[PDB]
Amino acid sequence: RQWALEDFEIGRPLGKGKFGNVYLAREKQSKFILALKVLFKAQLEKAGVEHQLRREVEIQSHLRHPNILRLYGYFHDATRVYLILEYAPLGTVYRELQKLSKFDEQRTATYITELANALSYCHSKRVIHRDIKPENLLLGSAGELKIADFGWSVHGTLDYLPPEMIEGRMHDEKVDLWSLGVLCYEFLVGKPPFEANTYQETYKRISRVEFTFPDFVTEGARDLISRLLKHNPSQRPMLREVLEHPWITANSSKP
């Protein structure tokens, strides 16, 4: 408890968003390596998010799972707000997708497994993430996936939102299964299935569930993805079925 900036040595930048940056940092007392997201109050005000940020910080501080990024604590000063985060040494799934273009089936299935675990734990707490992008997935030091950033509700680009959300209607914990499908596709294909040059058209493509597989996408992967990317949230499987999908169990690296 009770942390101030004078308690940390700052290091190189690890990333930069529209509300301040993440830095590598060390805790002076214990020599703990961590990340330090710095957000600017002046800018958090002008967007009107001080409340949503508090609600998300509140939600994250109670979450412990090896595939969810810890929030250790937080504090603030005259102009800024600081989140103390688990440092993930192997960087973003985004950068690793740019490096390799596509992932194979073992890596995809393994990531999808770790994601579903993290989401199942999330739903047990009745928590929905509502936005899982490769930008927001980090790699721990054994390359294990870690969901970062947000945890929006209990109740930017459109590529990852399900149709109920973009149409306005109400949305179960089932929005997370659409996202799993979008990622499973993006991991194997190298781009998300509703990508498009403009927002308004990604909208149409999402709305009507208009995607096509390249030739290399195997049968088992076509099945999982297709059973996740259903317009009626009613029809998406439970994460139990995902984790026991034959394509997953055959390709997912063993526990």
Ligand X SMILES: Nc1nc(Nc2ccc(S(N)(=O)=O)cc2)nn1C(=O)c1c(F)cccc1F
Ligand Y SMILES: O=C(O)c1cc(-c2cc(F)cc(Cl)c2)nc2ccccc12
How does strand 33-40 pair with strand 21-27? antiparallel
User: Which of the stretches 14-22, 43-51, 117-125, 151-159 binds ligand X when contact is defined by CB under 6 A?
Assistant: 14-22
CB under 5 to 8 A by kind: which of ligand Y, ligand X, none does 81 bind?
ligand Y
Q: Is 85 in the site for ligand X (CB under 6 A)?
A: yes
φ, ψ for residue 203, nearest 5 deg = -55, -55
The DSSP output letter for 237 is P
Q: Is 80 in the site for ligand Y (CB under 6 A)?
A: no
Nearest approach in angstroms of CB 218 to ligand X is 30
The beta-strand segments (E) located in the chain are 8-16, 21-27, 33-40, 71-76, 80-85, 137-139, 145-147
Q: Closer CB to ligand X, residue 160 or residue 211?
A: 160
Q: Are 139 and 189 in contact (CB under 8 A)?
A: no
User: Which of the stretches 85-93, 106-114, 159-167, 228-236 binds ligand X when contact is defined by CB under 6 A?
Assistant: 85-93
Q: Is 95 in the site for ligand X (CB under 6 A)?
A: yes
* 253/116 Cα distance (integer angstroms): 14
Q: Is 53 in the site for ligand Y (CB under 6 A)?
A: yes
The yes-or-no answer on residue 131 being catalytic is yes
19 three-state secondary structure: coil
Is position 133 annotated in a ligand binding site? no
In the complex, which residue's CB is closest to ligand X? 15
The percent helix, strand, coil of the chain (3-state, each to 5) is: 40, 20, 40
* 49/57 Cα distance (integer angstroms): 12
Q: Which of 131, 172, 176, 215 is catalytic?
A: 131
24 three-state secondary structure: strand
* 166/67 Cα distance (integer angstroms): 27
Interacting residues toward ligand X by CB under 6 A: 14-15, 22, 35, 37, 69, 85-89, 91-92, 95, 136, 138, 148-149
Interacting residues toward ligand Y by CB under 6 A: 41, 44-45, 50, 53-54, 57, 74, 76, 81
**Binding-site residue set:** 18, 37, 86-88, 135-136, 149
**Binding-site residue set for ATP:** 18, 37, 86-88, 135-136, 149
> Which positions are annotated as active-site residues?
131
